[PDB]
Amino acid sequence: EFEDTWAYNTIGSPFPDNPVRVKGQQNMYVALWYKFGKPIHGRAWNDNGNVECSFPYNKVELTGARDLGGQIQILTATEQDPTEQFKKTGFWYEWRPYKDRVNDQLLQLVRCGQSTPVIMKTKDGKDLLGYIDMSTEVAAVGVSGKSEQVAGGPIQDMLVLFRNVKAPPKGIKIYDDTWLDLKYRDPFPAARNPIAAGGRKVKSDDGTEMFQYVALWYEHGQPVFGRAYPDSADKTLANFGWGGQENAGAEIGSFQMLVVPDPDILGFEYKWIPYKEAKAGGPFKPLHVGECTPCLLKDANGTERLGNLHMGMEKATAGLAGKDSAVSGPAVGDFLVLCR
């Protein structure tokens, strides 16, 4: 019987290392709160590189640092890659229907006392992480200030988190993008094969030819693609341009990088394609998080910088000299975007 590693964190500060993601979510992680000594699982997400969170509490949703008492726990793993995690610990994290818990030779339910995390589809249609109180057999989740609950038979089919104690399967093709979680100035993940703008060195702002790698941040609730790259010490620098601002310092905290650890098992390919062509149809479409796609901006003199294209505004931005290098109108049509 194996054990999960839970880590206390201050709401409003960066995530601990290797936070456990919710299946199918770009920006959602498994969390745990105690209220009057009772465990309640809920969810955490990145805003401004910091932990924010939500838990259901007797008819309402609680998200406030004060309301919550300021401290929550995040589920962490020894390694983010399932095969690496299994090798190191004897288990990996898998989401399966609650009913599958009878298969105890294969799966161990993630629980704290009588609480277990559960993915709920809300009345509004969104998948959100809440909890099953296994004492009462009621599932609950908070959204928009309110709790929603389900009891009875239906809870048996809902996805919950298990430790899987056999090797992750092989002989399949990957269709999902692999996103690595990390923080500002963590060691650069070169061995994971991060995706470089244009698949080549760019003519960069510092006067050198250098690779610039696809990164994702969240600021004031909005996803922003930017860039990441190693400094001379092989630590990870990053730079995001959005809403008139450049963010390139330690305020970045937690962020994500697009990686391809095993290039040989992908069921798709990435291609950098001019935006006007990328939107014109066919198999290759922009990779997107919300309205945004990774975008290589290029100046009249050939200088290049990896940033974000918001497709709703058709405005491209990237960090430069304290502002966001904003470009709109037909000029964006000629900028390369990441497609697959």
Side-chain angles (χ1 to χ4, degrees):
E1 195 65 34
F2 294 114
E3 283 169 52
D4 305 315
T5 300
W6 294 90
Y8 268 101
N9 215 78
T10 304
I11 297 154
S13 299
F15 282 78
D17 301 336
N18 307 332
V20 170
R21 297 168 162 265
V22 176
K23 178 170 192 165
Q25 294 295 318
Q26 190 64 49
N27 188 20
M28 197 186 295
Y29 308 87
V30 169
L32 166 69
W33 177 51
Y34 290 90
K35 177 51 163 183
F36 302 123
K38 307 293 186 198
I40 297 168
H41 288 278
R43 71 192 181 268
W45 66 93
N46 181 324
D47 199 18
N48 312 127
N50 303 130
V51 167
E52 296 307 322
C53 56
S54 166
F55 298 88
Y57 169 66
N58 93 318
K59 290 179 292 297
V60 299
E61 174 197 30
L62 291 189
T63 56
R66 287 177 184 179
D67 282 339
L68 295 169
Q71 295 285 295
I72 59 156
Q73 276 175 309
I74 308 300
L75 182 59
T76 66
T78 79
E79 301 293 350
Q80 296 178 36
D81 178 75
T83 295
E84 290 200 81
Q85 165 73 190
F86 176 82
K87 283 202 51 214
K88 269 208 151 103
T89 74
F91 70 92
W92 65 282
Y93 285 116
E94 189 180 32
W95 297 87
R96 298 283 315 159
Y98 183 46
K99 66 202 173 182
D100 287 3
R101 76 195 104 101
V102 294
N103 193 11
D104 61 12
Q105 278 221 58
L106 177 68
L107 304 168
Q108 301 177 1
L109 186 67
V110 173
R111 68 188 278 170
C112 302
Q114 309 281 91
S115 178
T116 186
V118 68
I119 308 170
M120 301 193 55
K121 184 166 260 275
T122 67
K123 300 189 292 179
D124 343 32
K126 287 184 63 154
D127 282 3
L128 299 174
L129 193 71
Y131 84 123
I132 299 165
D133 183 334
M134 297 178 52
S135 283
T136 55
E137 307 157 69
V138 174
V141 65
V143 63
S144 297
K146 299 188 224 136
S147 68
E148 285 184 25
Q149 72 193 59
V150 167
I155 79 171
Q156 302 300 318
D157 291 329
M158 301 183 182
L159 273 46
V160 305
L161 188 58
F162 289 95
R163 310 152 216 132
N164 188 309
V165 303
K166 294 200 182 177
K170 300 185 181 305
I172 59 264
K173 297 285 200 194
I174 296 303
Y175 204 68
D176 291 323
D177 305 301
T178 302
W179 289 94
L180 173 71
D181 288 288
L182 80 163
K183 299 190 255 180
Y184 190 71
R185 290 184 58 76
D186 280 349
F188 191 81
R192 299 269 93 191
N193 314 126
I195 287 290
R200 55 148 171 91
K201 291 182 186 177
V202 313
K203 187 177 176 172
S204 90
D205 282 314
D206 83 346
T208 71
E209 298 292 300
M210 78 166 167
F211 290 110
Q212 295 187 340
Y213 306 93
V214 172
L216 175 67
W217 205 41
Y218 286 83
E219 39 165 318
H220 326 275
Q222 164 79 54
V224 182
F225 294 103
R227 86 194 90 121
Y229 62 99
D231 64 14
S232 55
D234 300 297
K235 295 313 196 276
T236 308
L237 306 187
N239 187 323
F240 305 95
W242 169 261
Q245 307 297 145
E246 174 179 48
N247 278 281
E251 80 285 351
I252 284 173
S254 300
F255 72 102
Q256 303 174 45
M257 289 177 56
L258 183 63
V259 292
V260 179
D262 188 356
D264 282 323
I265 59 154
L266 263 43
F268 64 100
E269 60 205 277
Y270 289 112
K271 298 278 150 276
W272 294 82
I273 301 169
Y275 179 62
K276 64 187 189 304
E277 178 185 340
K279 67 203 298 262
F284 286 102
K285 304 290 308 140
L287 179 148
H288 76 273
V289 175
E291 305 187 58
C292 298
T293 187
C295 180
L296 186 59
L297 288 70
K298 181 172 146 178
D299 291 348
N301 75 359
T303 302
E304 292 167 314
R305 67 189 65 76
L306 179 57
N308 185 259
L309 174 64
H310 188 287
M311 299 187 288
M313 297 159 178
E314 287 192 358
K315 176 175 296 186
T317 57
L320 176 58
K323 296 192 306 296
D324 62 0
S325 181
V327 182
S328 60
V332 310
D334 293 319
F335 292 167
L336 298 177
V337 295
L338 181 62
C339 302
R340 45 161 295 172

